[PDB]
Design a protein around this ligand. Sequence first.
Ligand SMILES: Nc1ncnc2c1ncn2[C@@H]1O[C@H](COP(=O)(O)OP(=O)(O)O)[C@@H](O)[C@H]1O
Ligand SMILES: Nc1ncnc2c1ncn2[C@@H]1O[C@H](COP(=O)(O)OP(=O)(O)O)[C@@H](O)[C@H]1O
Lengths: 74, 375, 375, 160, 126
Amino acid sequence: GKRQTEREKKKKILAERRKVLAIDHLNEDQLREKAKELWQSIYNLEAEKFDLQEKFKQQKYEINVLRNRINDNQ
Amino acid sequence: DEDETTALVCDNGSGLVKAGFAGDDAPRAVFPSIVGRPRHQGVMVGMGQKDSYVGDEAQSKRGILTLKYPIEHGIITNWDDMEKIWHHTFYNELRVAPEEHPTLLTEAPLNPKANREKMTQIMFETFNVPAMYVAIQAVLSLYASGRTTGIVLDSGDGVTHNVPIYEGYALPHAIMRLDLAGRDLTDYLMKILTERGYSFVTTAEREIVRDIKEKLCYVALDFENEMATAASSSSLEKSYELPDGQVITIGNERFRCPETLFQPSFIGMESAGIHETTYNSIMKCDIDIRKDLYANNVMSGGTTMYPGIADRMQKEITALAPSTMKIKIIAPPERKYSVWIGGSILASLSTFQQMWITKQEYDEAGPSIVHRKCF
Amino acid sequence: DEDETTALVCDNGSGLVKAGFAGDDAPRAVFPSIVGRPRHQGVMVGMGQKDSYVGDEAQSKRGILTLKYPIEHGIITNWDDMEKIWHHTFYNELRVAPEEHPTLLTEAPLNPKANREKMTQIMFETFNVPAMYVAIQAVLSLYASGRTTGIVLDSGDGVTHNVPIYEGYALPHAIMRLDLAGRDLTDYLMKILTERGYSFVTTAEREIVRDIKEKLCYVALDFENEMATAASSSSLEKSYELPDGQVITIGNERFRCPETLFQPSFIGMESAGIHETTYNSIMKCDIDIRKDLYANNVMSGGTTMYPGIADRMQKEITALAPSTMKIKIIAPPERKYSVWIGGSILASLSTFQQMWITKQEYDEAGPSIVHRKCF
Amino acid sequence: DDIYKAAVEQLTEEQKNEFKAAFDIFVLGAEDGCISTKELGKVMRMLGQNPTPEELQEMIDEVDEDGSGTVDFDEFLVMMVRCMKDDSKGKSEEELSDLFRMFDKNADGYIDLDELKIMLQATGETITEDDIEELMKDGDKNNDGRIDYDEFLEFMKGVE
Amino acid sequence: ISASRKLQLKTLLLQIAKQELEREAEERRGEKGRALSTRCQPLELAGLGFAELQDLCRQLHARVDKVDEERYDIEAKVTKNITEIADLTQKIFDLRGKFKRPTLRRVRISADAMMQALLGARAKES
Ligand SMILES: Nc1ncnc2c1ncn2[C@@H]1O[C@H](COP(=O)(O)OP(=O)(O)O)[C@@H](O)[C@H]1O
Ligand SMILES: Nc1ncnc2c1ncn2[C@@H]1O[C@H](COP(=O)(O)OP(=O)(O)O)[C@@H](O)[C@H]1O
């Protein structure tokens, strides 16, 4: 039950984060703005991804130090 | 921390999970299949304290924990607890990242498909393993022992599978699935130790009795001779130290507990007994098979370590067997560890490299793939 | 110097009140839990003279005052008198207004809820404290001693609580409170000193006998040997000086007072004594807990300050305890003040700030809130 | 000790002269010119404090460098700076953790001698071999020749 | 070397470490700018007609879903590392526990109050 939920859940979350786009009621000028808005969303997501990658590296460092401290104090 | 993408091997029993990497001759560690939980209300502030403890943590802090096992006679029923056990095993102690290694798990061939399908699912879906295989414990002890033929008798903590193998083939009509194992032997011992004045009920007490059995008990080559003697004289008692400085001595209970394997009626079970189920697995095989299985009574798992059991099982089958036939027990030191060892050997065989379920095959086939690729 | 809104810490017992600021390592002052009142008719005018005197004022002017204690056998019985004890403690000697500081008050684990409810009510309604917490004295004793595990044997002035703690968790089924404490020991001494020809019954006299007990009692690790000699020879008598120049010598009575802690029948109590309640708190805990509690009997309260009690207690517990086991006593200098010290430790923990009852929570729920949030 | 010893080095001559006048009050009548628990107790009581004999012995032990059981004037100056703080709070662990990472150039989790030397030279102060060896001996409490994270926190305790 | 010299060196060591920490942050910001230039390159809208713009919006929307999935995957690894850091932190604290609970004392009479009481008007610099 729960593992299937976790797999369904990452996909469910990603589906929830998927917005609905429509391009028929918009004219050419509005579509150019819509494209700029989507680009900015991609940019912000890439910026967040970058920050997480940086955090992940500092975390590996911190984990290695904690493991060494445990091994030296045991 | 491995320098090769060696398969991982983990033997998940009702007792302990044996785990290490393929190619070794032993697990790196044994991880008791236990998840512990505090059973008391905290009073002091700043004490840390988690909602649960796993494996050796669960036993080390057991004084205030209630301890439970996720595996019932070979089948995992509590998957949350097994993810914690598996995570701890790979993450903290084996120093393993399954994402980079194939993983081989073990199981009785007689257990519900739900367990082999779910174990395949968790390594692929929770641990992201590149490949899987779930192996048969009869097979695994035979590989570890250097045998292709025999009756494999586990008498483990959880289940006794009683499975005859000939020339590497299963002989399924001769299989005796038995609901009798060390977990039942332990409960019996707690009741007869109660008769002696030592009441064992709670988790600390249950773990003590399992420790008493493991260090003090034996089956006896001849039960009645040991029974009559132990019931008549203190010369047959053996002591055990309880953690609080108190002691217990055990007399005929020392063997009455293990005896349940030969006499299941001791715990209310309707069963032939391990020597008859072993016998029937030989007897039900074809007439030209019987001679090879008589000569290959193969041990697996724990309890096969009891004094008098390798000699007793050979005698008990001999007593039921036809004349001419030569009856022999194969009881290697690879005892209590042969299933894990067989996993190491099997995972590493060149002939087994195509038996692995890959991640791509799993994703396309779904969880039922274990039925088509493993067993 | 106090340049930060540090919590204030006060331990209010049936004997004395320890008070200071969180972050220090001792109460700044100890204020006896006394409210004194004049019991004579005045003749001179323009002599000042209060309706009541508190703490050290009550003792300094005691020649004509009757001295009453607002706290008895572990609880507040008179909270209007405690408002005055606290007002003096905070505003005259600590010279702090609780209105700008959280306040930490303490009690025993099974202490009647009225005690924590009145401590909460007075500090929020008459002192307007921004926050409150009522802590458990056993926690605080362990914090002062550097322990998470042990038996807190806290014999104080009005009560012995006796509470086992393991990994910071209380084991409440193993708590054995006794109506056996320092106030009763004083009364026992007054009766036996009366037998010697020194009859003490009035407030001034009761305070003298308490002072005698504090300076002369040595308890005796071997009381039978001490009574045999102390009752036979003046060589073991200690001279005590009284306020009017009189001298009283005390012999076996010197230890017979403390002897009541081992023989409670001396004061009419039905009890096995403090060493047995320590032992029973260990015995009612699980056997994987007991080993750590045996190695950590934790001394708190005030009876722990006799020159010989640590040996009297270790001898009695080890005598009751199983062999093999190591029985030890933790008896730090933080004696008699370990609750206050622990109070300062608790109040200053970062892991304790979420535990405060705020004034807003109090005003919405009323004083019964302490029973739900603290422990 | 080190943070207090530095504060003493920086005291002006007039400040030291005033502390000497105070010291002279404390040691008036003492057989060896030094402050023992009898002189320390008489002054603390004169000042309105009521320390126990144990508290008085601990106050002396905290600054006693020779093991004399007494306080001389040099030890007195340390007692007087210890009794006051300019360096209140003293930061905390999270801030030291980020600074530790900056000393650990190879990102191994330890500060070795080469790392310490690079950081000391960067300060601009003349660094002698004795400055390097002494700080590493003061930091590495387990004698491996390196400062770990827990040793670093003890090493920089109280350092503003 | 004097303890006074050691302190001065420790205070300067911490000041440089702080400068290096600021330097690291500035360099990381520069690295972030360059990474974003590669991963999220500018739109070229000139010359696109109406239908081409409708297809672009759909293409960008699809990319938003893919980037969010990649972000999720790194976030999941970060989350697992937090759990591990929290557990190791508790383990070290317990190993480094034992007899070490710290205390403060109030026997340390402020040297300012002490100097005013013992010297009176003579106490001007201290
Ligand atoms: N020396 C022994 N004496 C008595 N029983 C044993 C002995 N060795 C193993 N057994 C029993 O067998 C079980 C452990 O064996 P094992 O097969 O390794 O468990 P698992 O299937 O989890 O790997 C326990 O129930 C233990 O009590
Ligand atoms: N050296 C001693 N000898 C005998 N009794 C003592 C001694 N020291 C303290 N007591 C007694 O212990 C009690 C004080 O207990 P304590 O815990 O320190 O204060 P409280 O319980 O109010 O916090 C009083 O009855 C006091 O007379």
